[PDB]
Amino acid sequence: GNVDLVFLFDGSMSLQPDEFQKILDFMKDVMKKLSNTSYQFAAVQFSTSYKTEFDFSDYVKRKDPDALLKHVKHMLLLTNTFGAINYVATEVFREELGARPDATKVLIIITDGEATDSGNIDAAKDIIRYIIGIGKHFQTKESQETLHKFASKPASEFVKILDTFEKLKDLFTELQKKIYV
């Protein structure tokens, strides 16, 4: 079946320039590898506020990862993950914006720490949520477990902890394999 996937990427002040750039390249690589498939994409940047870098309809109009992300600017603010996931649920996955009703909703969240806000993400729980926590903040099991609440179950599959942003390239594989079974 069809798959509508949204990249929700962290743009807080805790990420270094090169780190932020590696997220961008990850999104581009994934897209290029999935061009001309059942996949349709959208991408939202989150820090303090939520910015839809491109909606599903922008992707359909121009299936060019480089052009779609061309003007992305690292926000350098907070890490409002609750507001971010909720925004994706209500503002991104809409037919008006190009979302397909027959499609499987997938969300790939990339971040380096804990949310600076709070609440619940119940409105986005139907979406297949993969979360990629990266860096020094996720060394212990205790710290890694804070990501569990944003991901699908079990956490053993949907929560991916990387020690470096360099680990992003060697990660595209796993995802698409499990995204449809």
From Swiss-Prot:
Leukocytes. Residues 4-175 form the VWFA domain. It is found in: Cell membrane. Glycans are attached at N36. In resting T-cells, up to 40% of surface ITGAL is constitutively phosphorylated. Phosphorylation causes conformational changes needed for ligand binding and is necessary for activation by some physiological agents. The integrin I-domain (insert) is a VWFA domain. Integrins with I-domains do not undergo protease cleavage. The I-domain is necessary and sufficient for interaction with ICAM1 and F11R. Belongs to the integrin alpha chain family. Heterodimer of an alpha and a beta subunit. The ITGAL alpha subunit associates with the ITGB2 beta subunit. Interacts with THBD. Interacts with CD226. (Microbial infection) Interacts with SARS-CoV Orf7a protein. Integrin ITGAL/ITGB2 is a receptor for ICAM1, ICAM2, ICAM3 and ICAM4. Integrin ITGAL/ITGB2 is a receptor for F11R. Integrin ITGAL/ITGB2 is a receptor for the secreted form of ubiquitin-like protein ISG15; the interaction is mediated by ITGAL. Involved in a variety of immune phenomena including leukocyte-endothelial cell interaction, cytotoxic T-cell mediated killing, and antibody dependent killing by granulocytes and monocytes. Contributes to natural killer cell cytotoxicity. Involved in leukocyte adhesion and transmigration of leukocytes including T-cells and neutrophils. This is Integrin alpha-L. The gene is ITGAL. The chain holds residues 153 to 333 of 1170 of the full protein.
